[PDB]
């Protein structure tokens, strides 16, 4: 069903700071072309969109897009089917969707001058990085090479252009400032559940260690593993015997231990190889990254936690990509998220 | 104040844009990170589109098109969290599209692996950016004559300055032709519709209408650039400082300009635009001459048989509006005047 009944909806900005240019502002002088003189710039703020059902039940859900993405990925699939925003408002949760600082409606910190530069200060780097379609195809495990699909794929074929059009670059905002914005949002919302994806996986783990209001985490294919400082286990290189996964993030154990106090689930899709795949770099990367996450969850459980890894094929769902929540079976993926929320009492008031 | 909204459906999609390519071939066995332009296809200049459809809509869908440096947020909520025009017009039984144009918000910002906007030797957009300060925006938007000051009658949601200015940012140097192209494609996709524009999207919406007969009406909140038939720009005075000018008017071929005479067009202006020259307040004076230029543009449309009008909100009994009347404290009354325009032309009936 596509129908939704909203008690209220809207959006707002939260977080960020200001930076200032030199000199003072004279309203009698030409304002355009724009100048840094006398300037205050608001930078690194985050965009937040909320939709609240009638008679909400349980905690609000905060959906946090992966790297180079926006809240669009929770609104609709590339072929136009309802995304998790609609599905979970229908499931009677208030739903927040964010565009983190540096992405989408979040702030991209640039001024009058070379990109990211405020006079002599580099706020973000002028040189950007950004995946190609080809790199994203293999990262997302549509298939082993660009243009090729795994036979079992749940990707909405024929909507490749729509899908890749949602992706873009991120400026070099410090991860600390991204975590800060979401901590401030969590303080504003109250008790809530973070639903993260890829790059926002590690960021959501960090937010939870700073914000007792985070009462649970579901992370779709997190990209960076997290461990207590000085307790990173041995992680092998890739099958090329040259490359490594993303360097695991290390946090003080007193913060890491907060992860044991809430239910945490990492969700993985299909077509991650069991054995080394030297011919397919990103397939092998996912093999080792998933392994690293298994050790991270184990470390949480050894501190008394309740941290689990859900492989969708074990639940009977075959062919999911790195975006299970926009795949053809995303309704079934959503049902498994509702199951997690229900078991942990996160769907009751 | 009235917050409930009932949607038959909602969602979002990407439309428009093109692809550009890097050199060489992509090898899936080589490290994919750090990202490389080698063998790369990049989708650039695409537009983000959100839609919310009421149950049993009445009349044409509305396409709300944010001003310069903005996003669809400005139609979703006001800075103090009151309902924006998206909610108000779904409640008014129109399907509502809100866009983030190419280069803004969820639209594409075309950059790659290299200095901003550069794909190897090709400059897609400039590496040097421009962006208003808070102070520049304060005076541009006519909150008051100088930063920190408010006009006596102001409808701005005072106290929410941080929320308001946080919504604004830079735009890369995407060609206006490609922004117009994306919206033409959207209008082809949705069918007959009304464009509701603001500031920088004023002139872009006029251009879209000349390329898309599905545009059945335009309401433009304080358009920033005037439009005239080629070679027929009237005399427009410089500003009171004797050296500055308004934005150079856009000139289009007469056969395209004439298409603007076939649909109802309304330009809406807020308050505190001076009648006489103001050399001490550059943006106030800029708005005086810009509004004058638009009055001449509308007259040119009407002399060709058009249905063009200028609504000064104070004349309608609304005092104190800023450059964003649709997020001001009286935005419900502003919305009522938009509903009036739609009703007058049957754009609220099936």
Numbering used by the authors:
A (entry chain A): 12 to 360
B (entry chain B): 11 to 360
Please, what does the article write about this entry?
SulE, an esterase, which detoxifies a variety of sulfonylurea herbicides through de-esterification, provides an attractive approach to remove environmental sulfonylurea herbicides and develop herbicide-tolerant crops. SulE catalyzes the de-esterification of a variety of sulfonylurea herbicides, such as MM, BM, SM, TM, TrM, EM, and CE, to the corresponding herbicidal-inactive parent acid. The structures show that SulE is a dimer with a lid loop in a domain-swapped β-hairpin covering the active site from the opposing monomer.
SulE was overexpressed in E. coli BL21 (DE3), purified, and crystallized in a space group P21. The asymmetric unit contains two monomers. SulE is a homodimer, consistent with its oligomerization state in solution as determined by gel filtration chromatography. For each monomer, residues 12–360 are clearly defined based on the electron densities. The overall structure of SulE monomer contains a catalytic domain (residues 12–27, 55–112, and 185-360), a cap domain (residues 113–184) and a protruding β hairpin (residues 28–54). The catalytic domain is a typical α/β hydrolase fold, with eight β-strands (β1 to β8), six α-helices (α1 to α6) and two 310-helices (η1 and η2). The cap domain (residues 113–184) is inserted in the loop connecting β4 and α2 and is composed of two α-helices (αCAP1 and αCAP2). Particularly, a β hairpin, which contains a lid loop (residues 31–51) between β9 and β10, is far away from the core region in each subunit, but cover the cap domain and close to the active center of another subunit in the dimer structure. His333 Nε2 is hydrogen bonded to Ser209 Oγ at a distance of 2.79 Å, and is responsible for the activation of the nucleophile Ser209. Glu232 Oδ2 is strongly hydrogen bonded to His333 Nδ1 at a distance of 2.64 Å to correctly position the imidazole ring of His333 for catalysis.
